[PDB]
Amino acid sequence: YVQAQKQFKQAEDSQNSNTLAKLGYAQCLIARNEVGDATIYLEKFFKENQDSKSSEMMLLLGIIYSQSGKSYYKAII
């Protein structure tokens, strides 16, 4: 998980257009139980890329917000 997350970060730094690398980075954050860190990274990516059609990213955001509970409105959206 540490090595995979580092590799995903290096992939993102090499070419920022690789959305799949960032999604794998978030998945690795989830793997390391970094719920808050993954949430912050996902919010940063979504706010920078509000027009991106990453359906799985939005599904993961909704699941995270439902687990949080207070952010139900973003989860619905």
Partner: protein
């Protein structure tokens, strides 16, 4: 005062507890299945 007989008693009695049927949490409502589903390759 010999007039009409009537008693006034406001009714604000609390009803008995309902004990409604309980919802069952989904499998994705538990932390471990959530972790397994999100960490899918």
């Amino acid at each position: 005062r010999q007039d009409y007989i009537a008693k006034v008693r406001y009714q604000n009695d609390l009803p008995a507890p309902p004990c409604p049927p309980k919802l069952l949490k989904y499998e994705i409502e538990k932390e471990a299945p959530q972790k397994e589903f999100l960490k899918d390759s």
